[PDB]
Amino acid sequence: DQLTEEQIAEFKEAFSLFDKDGDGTITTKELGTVMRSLGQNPTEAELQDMINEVNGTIDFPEFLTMMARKMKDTDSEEEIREAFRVFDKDGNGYISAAELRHVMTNLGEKLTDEEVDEMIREAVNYEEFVQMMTA
């Protein structure tokens, strides 16, 4: 979905190195070992729930979908938090309301001036604005 090329490549490399020759069918213990080798450390109940969500053989598309559920979102949130501290001179996380209004008006697609002003008045930290936009 919203993954990166390097992440999918590493996942496929790990799946090909752990699984034997033949089809992509793996067992429950094999899936747990692949998850532990990939970097994730899920509990027993969480692993059982993820297995039930997808013979008991986990194929490549289901595994890629399970890996793309939250990793891409976390990476995007980290990238947004890193890029939000660019307009600030010192990057302390707090900026004036006029600067944020100008940034929202002159950037971020085409937005109406009245709507941008109303959104700025309804809303100091960038994380607070991100959480308000996510809500």
Residue numbers in the entry: 3 to 56, 61 to 129, 137 to 148
Text taken from the publication that reported this structure:
Ryanodine receptors (RyR) are >2-MDa membrane proteins that allow for the release of Ca2+ from the ER and SR, thus mediating a range of Ca2+-dependent processes. Each forms homotetrameric assemblies of ~5000 residue long subunits. Here, a collection of cryoEM structures provides insights into the molecular consequences of MHrelated RyR mutation R615C, and how apoCaM opens RyR1.
For WT pRyR1, this resulted in two main classes that could both be refined and with structures built. The main class, corresponding to 70% of the particles, represents closed channels, whereas 27% of the particles contributed to an open channel class. Starting with the structure of the closed complex, the N-lobe is the best resolved, and mostly makes contacts with α helices in the N-terminal part of the Bsol region, encoded by residues 2190–2242 (=interface 1). In addition, the N-lobe is close to a short loop (~2595–2600) connecting two helices further downstream in the Bsol region (=interface 2). Additional interactions include two helices in the Jsol region (=interface 4), including a peptide (residues 1975–1999) previously identified as CaMBD1. Correspondingly, in the cryo-EM condition, the WT pRyR1 + apoCaM dataset shows mostly closed channels, whereas the mutant shows mostly open channels.
